[PDB]
Amino acid sequence: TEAREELRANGYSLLPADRLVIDAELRQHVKELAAEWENLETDFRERAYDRFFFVPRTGEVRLRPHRPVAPLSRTTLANPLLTRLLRADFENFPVPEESWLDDPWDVQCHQFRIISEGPHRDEVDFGVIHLMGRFNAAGGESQVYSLERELVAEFCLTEQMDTMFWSDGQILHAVRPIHPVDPTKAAVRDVLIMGYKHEPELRREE
Amino acid sequence: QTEAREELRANGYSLLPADRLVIDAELRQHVKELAAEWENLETDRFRERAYDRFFFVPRTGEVRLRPHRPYFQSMNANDYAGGIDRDVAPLSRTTLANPLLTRLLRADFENFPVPEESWLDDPWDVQCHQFRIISTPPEGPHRDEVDFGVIHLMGRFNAAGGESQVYSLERELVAEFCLTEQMDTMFWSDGQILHAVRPIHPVDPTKAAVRDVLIMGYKHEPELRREEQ
Ligand SMILES: O=C(O)CCC(=O)C(=O)O
Ligand SMILES: O=C(O)CCC(=O)C(=O)O
Ligand SMILES: [Fe+3]
Ligand SMILES: [Fe+3]
Numbered sequence: 001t002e003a004r005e006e007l008r009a010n011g012y013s014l015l016p017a018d019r020l021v022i023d024a025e026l027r028q029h030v031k032e033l034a035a036e037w038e039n040l041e042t043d044f045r046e047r048a049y050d051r052f053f054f055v056p057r058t059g060e061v062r063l064r065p066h067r068p069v070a071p072l073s074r075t076t077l078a079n080p081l082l083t084r085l086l087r088a089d090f091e092n093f094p095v096p097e098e099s100w101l102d103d104p105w106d107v108q109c110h111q112f113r114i115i116s117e118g119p120h121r122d123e124v125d126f127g128v129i130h131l132m133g134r135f136n137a138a139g140g141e142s143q144v145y146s147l148e149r150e151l152v153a154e155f156c157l158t159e160q161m162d163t164m165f166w167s168d169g170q171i172l173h174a175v176r177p178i179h180p181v182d183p184t185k186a187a188v189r190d191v192l193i194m195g196y197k198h199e200p201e202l203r204r205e206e
Numbered sequence: 207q208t209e210a211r212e213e214l215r216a217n218g219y220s221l222l223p224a225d226r227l228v229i230d231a232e233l234r235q236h237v238k239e240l241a242a243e244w245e246n247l248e249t250d251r252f253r254e255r256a257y258d259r260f261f262f263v264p265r266t267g268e269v270r271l272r273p274h275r276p277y278f279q280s281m282n283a284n285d286y287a288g289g290i291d292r293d294v295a296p297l298s299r300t301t302l303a304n305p306l307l308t309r310l311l312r313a314d315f316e317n318f319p320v321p322e323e324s325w326l327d328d329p330w331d332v333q334c335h336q337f338r339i340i341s342t343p344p345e346g347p348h349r350d351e352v353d354f355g356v357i358h359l360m361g362r363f364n365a366a367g368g369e370s371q372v373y374s375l376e377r378e379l380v381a382e383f384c385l386t387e388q389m390d391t392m393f394w395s396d397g398q399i400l401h402a403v404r405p406i407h408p409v410d411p412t413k414a415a416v417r418d419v420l421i422m423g424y425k426h427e428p429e430l431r432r433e434e435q
């Protein structure tokens with residue numbers, strides 16, 4: 001399938017919301033999940049964070065104990081779209097060995113709000129970003145670089161649920177800063193990002 | 207089974223995807239016969255069901271089909287004898303004749319951390335539920351009031367959602383997983399966790415979403431005596 005092929009070749013794939021089918025339920029689960037971004041703690045950047053124990057074969061997901069950033073809100077974690085996104089996102093990743101589908105994975109779930117970088121990697125095996133909202137913001141392009149620190153592509157997530165897949169060990173990435181269009185109002189860019197790292201020796205935590 | 211036992215002791219549940227099983231021709235066939243039974247449950251959003259209780263002695267492998275207590279008897283007595291308090295039809299004759307049913311009932315039990323070795327010589331009541339969930343174009347966290355549980359996914363049709371939730375005894379969400387393939391399996395210790403399943407919704411919204419599960423609940427019953435069969 002498309003998304004899996006592209007990360008094998010290029011190291012990244014795009015999936016704009018236009019090409020997604022958004023029913024009324026999913027509509028309202030996005031509306032509720034996206035409303036959470038109004039309620040992140042500072043340290044301008046407002047954020048929330050948690051990690052998940054994940055096994056793709058069974059779809060098992062476990063909220064790992066919170067180790068710092070503020071934890072994801074109770075309503076966020078209650079929203080079925082969080083872990084449905086988590087599971088669905090993962091299918092778009094070219095895993096090198098089917099066996100890894102049966103090993104544990106650490107999945108970092110980041111709620112970021114930016115209020116108005118060089119090429120790096122997020123130190124995971126695969127990542128995903130979903131644009132939750134954009135308000136009075138110019139710039140903020142997503143950038144794919146090579147391991148040679150040479151820009152190979154640049155694009156802009158603009159619509160809610162716009163999504164980008166990437167193989168964090170193949171490319172380097174960054175996002176240009178955002179600045180307000182109306183100089184009197186602030187720029188706000190609401191992003192949901194998850195980093196997936198294969199961890200065969202991770203254990204369940206009680 | 208050893209891993210499943212410790213997993214039940216630590217976490218209160220254990221997962222066994224069908225991929226981790228070796229289904230030969232004979233077994234694969236009995237599975238298909240068993241799953242097809244779900245196409246013939248009684249019509250009373252939509253929930254079709256059948257049910258029976260089995261007398262079970264783990265040491266000898268003895269399974270006896272307990273008589274189906276009529277609903278009019280339970281209701282008018284205000285005494286459901288441990289069983290469910292609903293009006294449900296019996297398991298079909300071709301469900302009971304399928305050897306996979308007896309096999310599952312015996313084999314599933316070997317995944318439970320039985321606290322006392324003497325318990326293997328006592329009778330156990332084993333409730334057997336065939337559930338078909340239909341969503342045409344939810345219950346909260348609970349226990350089943352048994353010692354141990356097992357759920358086998360028989361079928362999933364046009365179904366999204368339907369995630370199984372494991373909750374702590376303080377009603378806190380601790381785990382969540384997806385039975386997706388036929389015979390995907392989940393064992394749990396029913397006094398150690400709470401559980402629930404999310405609703406299904408249709409993928410193609412013009413057609414119904416359908417989810418078929420076999421559920422068994424094992425309750426240690428040392429006073430239970432044999433009944434006629
Ligand atoms: O905002 C983006 O496009 C990605 C942000 C990112 O990579 C990070 O915050 O680590
Ligand atoms: O169908 C499931 O996953 C479990 C449903 C359940 O808990 C029940 O029907 O008692
Ligand atoms: Fe990054
Ligand atoms: Fe239950």
Ligand SMILES: [Fe+3]
Nearest residue numbers: 057058386387
């Ligand atoms: Fe599965």
